[PDB]
Nucleic acid binder design. Structure first.
Ligand SMILES: [Zn+2]
Ligand SMILES: [Zn+2]
Ligand SMILES: [Zn+2]
Ligand SMILES: [Zn+2]
Ligand SMILES: [Zn+2]
Ligand SMILES: [Zn+2]
Ligand SMILES: [Zn+2]
Ligand SMILES: [Zn+2]
Length: 721
DNA sequence: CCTACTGCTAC
DNA sequence: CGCGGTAGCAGTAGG
């Protein structure tokens, strides 16, 4: 008997047949994975192998209504292809279309989450299913394919971050090599795939049947009731703890604690921002790229996203990066207090919360002139730029002149941990910064939204109410001129439209409604004298959904040391930022002076070089460079490397005399020599002025420069709305 | 009273 | 030119 319902299904020839227990079903992650699976069929035969693609992250069958599960075509597709049912407890795979189930995921963190979801799905749906030894299978592929180029040619395959990281630190320096990041399951070429299958028993591992504490760890990972537990489960995790590679048998208990947990950690990392710059890895990459390129002139989002992705080693779909770019630009009421990128297009409106934005290919963006005032360029050389893909990418964090996290706030959903942080008035933030500066007591801050005209009151510490505005403009006629921030027009629109035409369960309570929105909100509502009184008893704000709460009881973020932390007060966040920022201001000056001193040396020896040649004391014309090099050292000339660091001792380590002989012949002309002297003089002056400033003098300098730019920003923003 | 939903980066 | 599904957490409003 054959299946019909599912076309993409490459059903094994002997599936469901007397050899069902022998057949294996390969569940792929995506069609990129599927392509590989069907390509492997040409090697292992269709008789005992079949494959079916999983569309997306799988449904979590825990805490799901039988209706939701039944509605999920994906889950139903598997039950039908495997010939699976609930009743009783599985004893043998004899009653099934297939006798084995193999999981083919990218082998990335999200791929691990897919596996866990499948496992969770099998363990939950089908009692005794995972009891059967050798039922669940896992196909694995390499994470990093290293290629040794110059020294002794051999390719290495690492199946996890740690293995490759222990090599990268303890072996890599000994070779000239290149690392390719093997994501997809859809890119791998066939020349090295036909080998994957010729010897698959090593690319094949088997999940050990359920043992003690296996079911408990699954529940710990996928039980919608154990959020708090995971938090600790992540705290307990010890770096370096990782599954043995090539072992060929996996206990489920330590597949979760050694592989899946890796995803959870990465999940939080990307979903929850850092306290210092209020950025998530994605956002931080975008700005880094925008810094790398000169984004003073606009380019379309569909082009920026791939660009940023390429130069920051972004390992995830570009689509996810493009949306991030959109989110960073969006300038409607209820979105960023300060948008670091300009919405040069239909970047979405307040109506649907930016969801009505145009495709990335229609819109354009660029750096807000104020962005570089916030993230000062002089700080760039200070940060620690993450090493990834044998190549430097974005920093661990940026250090804004003011807590940006407080300016814009943040929201995210990871594993075990969650976050919310509302926006705050930058003017208040700078005020408290001046207070921290002046050894003064901080003033308490309340949530603030750019261009918003509603009112906010504090109920309890960490709790606020947010009111819109409803006014009676006529007998039986009300007018809504403002909604609670983050309350989109379409939400109230549908609600009003509901009361106007009534509903199956609720009787109509609205006589008429209109929309007259301009650069503001304007709902003109008409009520019968009967409803007017009824609304007075319920409250006009309460019955029109013009009241929304704001909770500061879940302000979570990574601290300066990369450790996830929950903040109990707004000032605590600002305080932790301040001291880290102050430290980097002194650190900024110390770096600038060092750099400036080097430049001065560079300029001075360049002048001496030209000067001597003009006297005719030194001659470069002819004379083997070997002989010229000796002359220079013997005259006291120091070598310079690409960074700009001098060497007086006698390669990047030592430097070269390229800063002299590398100059254009132009530099010998008097007009160039004069320009050179002016430059040297300007650098000496820069060094003198710098040494006359304290870390706070410099910080205060940036702050006032920001205040001036911020004022213009507020104008341009109010102008464009 | 439990449910369902919203938000957001990723699949 | 566009639509849809899923994870994960905290809290709020709906049936
Ligand atoms: Zn994938
Ligand atoms: Zn992937
Ligand atoms: Zn191999
Ligand atoms: Zn065993
Ligand atoms: Zn990631
Ligand atoms: Zn990487
Ligand atoms: Zn610290
Ligand atoms: Zn969609």
């Amino acid at each position: 008997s054959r299946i019909t319902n599912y076309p993409k299904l490459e059903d094994a020839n002997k599936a469901g047949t007397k050899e069902g227990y022998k057949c294996t079903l390969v569940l792929t992650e995506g069609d990129s994975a599927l392509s590989l699976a069907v390509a492997g069929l040409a090697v292992v035969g269709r008789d005992y192998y079949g494959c079916y693609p999983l569309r997306g992250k799988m449904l979590n069958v825990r805490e799901a209504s039988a209706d939701q599960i039944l509605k999920n075509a994906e889950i139903q597709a598997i039950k039908k292809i495997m010939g699976l049912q609930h009743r009783k407890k599985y004893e043998d795979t004899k009653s099934l279309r297939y006798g084995h189930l193999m999981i083919m995921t990218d082998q990335d963190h999200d791929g691990s989450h897919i596996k866990g979801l499948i496992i969770n799905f099998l363990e939950s749906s089908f009692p005794g299913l995972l009891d059967i030894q050798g039922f669940l299978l896992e196909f694995i592929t390499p994470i990093i394919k290293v290629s040794i180029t110059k020294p002794t040619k051999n390719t290495i395959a690492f199946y996890n971050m740690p293995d490759y990281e222990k090599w990268r630190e303890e072996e890599s320096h000994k070779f000239t090599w290149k690392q390719k990041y093997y994501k997809g399951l859809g890119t791998s070429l066939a020349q090295e795939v036909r080998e994957y299958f010729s010897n698959l028993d090593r690319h094949l591992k088997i999940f050990h049947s359920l043992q003690g504490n296996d079911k408990d760890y699954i529940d710990l990972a996928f039980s919608k009731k154990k959020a708090d537990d995971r938090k600790e489960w992540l705290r307990q995790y010890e770096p370096g703890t990782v599954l043995d590679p090539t072992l060929k048998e996996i206990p489920i208990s330590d597949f979760i604690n050694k592989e899946l947990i890796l995803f959870s950690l990465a999940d939080n990392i990307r979903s929850i921002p850092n306290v210092l710059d209020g950025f998530k890895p994605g956002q931080r990459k975008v700005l880094y790229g925008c810094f790398k390129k000169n984004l003073k002139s606009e380019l379309k989002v569909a082009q920026l996203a791939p660009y940023v992705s390429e130069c920051t080693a972004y390992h995830h779909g570009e689509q996810s990066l493009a949306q991030t770019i959109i989110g960073l630009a969006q300038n409607f009421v209820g979105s960023n207090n300060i948008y670091l990128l300009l919405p040069n297009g239909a970047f979405g409106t307040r109506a649907t919360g930016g969801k009505d934005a145009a495709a990335a290919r229609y819109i354009y963006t660029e750096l807000n002139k104020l962005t570089r005032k916030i993230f000062h360029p002089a700080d760039d050389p200070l940060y620690k730029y993450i090493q990834e893909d044998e190549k430097t990418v974005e920093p661990e964090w940026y250090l804004p002149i003011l807590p940006m996290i407080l300016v814009n706030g943040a929201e995210g959903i990871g594993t075990g941990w969650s976050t919310y942080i509302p926006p705050f008035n930058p003017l208040e933030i700078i005020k408290n910064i001046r207070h921290l500066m002046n050894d003064e007591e901080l003033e308490q801050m309340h949530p603030w939204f750019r261009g918003w005209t509603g009112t906010i009151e504090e109920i309890e510490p960490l709790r606020y109410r947010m009111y819109g505005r409803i006014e009676q403009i006529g007998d039986n006629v009300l007018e809504i001129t403002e909604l609670p921030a983050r309350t989109w027009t379409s939400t109230i629109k549908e609600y009003l439209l509901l009361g106007l035409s009534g509903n199956d369960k609720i009787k109509p309570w609205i006589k008429d409604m209109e929309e007259q929105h301009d650069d503001n909100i304007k709902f003109i509502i008409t009520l019968s004298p009967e409803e007017m009184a009824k609304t007075r008893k319920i409250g006009f704000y309460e019955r029109f959904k013009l009241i929304s709460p704001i909770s500061l009881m879940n302000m979570v973020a990574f601290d300066p040391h990369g450790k996830i932390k929950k903040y109990n007060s707004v000032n605590e966040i600002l305080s932790e930022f301040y001291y880290v920022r102050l430290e980097y201001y002194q650190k900024r000056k110390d770096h600038m002076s060092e750099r400036l001193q080097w430049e001065v040396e560079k300029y001075s020896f360049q002048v001496k070089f030209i000067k001597m040649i003009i006297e005719k004391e030194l001659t470069v014309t002819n004379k083997p460079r070997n002989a010229i090099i000796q002359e220079l050292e013997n005259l006291g000339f120091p070598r310079f490397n690409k960074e700009g660091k001098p060497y007086y001792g006698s390669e990047e380590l030592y430097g070269t005399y390229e800063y002299l002989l590398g100059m254009r012949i132009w530099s010998l002309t008097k007009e160039r020599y004069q320009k050179l002297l002016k430059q040297k003089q300007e650098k000496e002056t820069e060094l003198e002025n710098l040494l006359k400033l304290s870390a706070k003098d410099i910080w205060n300098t940036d702050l006032k420069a920001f205040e001036v730019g911020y004022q213009e920003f507020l104008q341009r923003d109010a102008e464009a709305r």
